[PDB]
């Protein structure tokens, strides 16, 4: 006596279902990456230049200590 009941889609329809490819760009330019790399290299070069010059001075100092102690 009751209404026919069955598994049916809701009145209207269903919400849209996405299927298309979605790969966002999500990246920097090539120039920016290359510039960051070159700047990092230059900073490291300058720091290591100072450090190695100081190390050469220290090495000369201890070599002179040896020279003084040798006789």
């Amino acid at each position: 006596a009751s209404k026919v009941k069955q598994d049916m889609p809701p009145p209207g329809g269903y919400g849209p279902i996405d299927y298309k490819r979605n790969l966002p760009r999500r990246g920097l330019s090539g120039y920016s990456m290359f510039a960051v790399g070159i700047g990092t290299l230059l900073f490291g070069y300058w720091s290591m230049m100072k450090w190695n010059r100081e190390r050469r001075r220290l090495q000369i100092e201890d070599f002179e200590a040896r020279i003084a102690l040798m006789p």
Binding site: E64, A65, R66, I67, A68, L69, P71
Partner: protein
């Protein structure tokens, strides 16, 4: 071929310096500043004679 002459053990005695390497390294700069003359004389004797038996004094 000849007999090698060597100094006697008495002539090889001296008041020894019995401080370690760290003490010597800590004092080295002032030691070479102050005691330059005898050390340089000894080295000149050493590289001119080429014989340890000739530079004991």
């Amino acid at each position: 071929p000849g007999i090698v002459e060597l100094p006697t053990l008495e002539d090889l005695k001296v008041q020894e310096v019995k401080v370690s390497s760290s003490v010597l390294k800590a004092a080295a700069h002032h030691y070479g500043a102050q005691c330059d003359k005898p050390n340089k004389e000894f080295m000149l004797c050493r590289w001119e004679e080429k014989d340890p038996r000739r530079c004991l004094e």
